[PDB]
């Protein structure tokens with residue numbers, strides 16, 4: 488679903504960008520927007536907690552990935568689909584996929600690869616919506632994400 492993709496892209500890319508810069512983007516978003524703003528707000532709350540709770544694991548995975556350049560960022564999808572497609576599907580695992588994206592985005596700013604944050608956000612959005620389309624539709628997309636963590 489291109490609507491699920493374009494909404495997910497805006498939520499993920501906004502969170503990854505603002506985690507990297509340290510500054511939040513202004514309130515107006517694209518289509519839907521009201522649901523997306525609520526989703527970004529719950530994502531900041533839950534996602535910041537996940538980064539703190541899994542700091543050692545995130546540090547370990549970052550080291551393993553050994554990200555140095557733009558080519559390393561594109562080779563990521565291979566591990567991303569491996570780890571994320573095996574096992575159960577729930578909102579906690581979706582938050583973990585996104586929060587680790589934020590953790591990687593901060594590292595990219597550090598190594599002067601900030602231009603890779605958008606392609607990375609795009610890659611996460613694509614893997615998420617492509618592999619979990621039906622489950623996301625059943626949960627009423629980003630409306631169900633907000634409700635679940637309410």
Ligand SMILES: O=C(O)c1[nH]c2ccccc2c1CCCOc1cccc2ccccc12
Pocket residue numbers: 544545548563566567570571580583584585587588591611
């Ligand atoms: O779901 C889980 O078990 C799990 N465990 C982890 C333990 C550590 C770090 C993440 C995870 C996850 C998230 C899914 C897989 O994420 C990824 C894997 C690889 C590269 C990535 C790059 C950008 C964003 C997500 C990535």
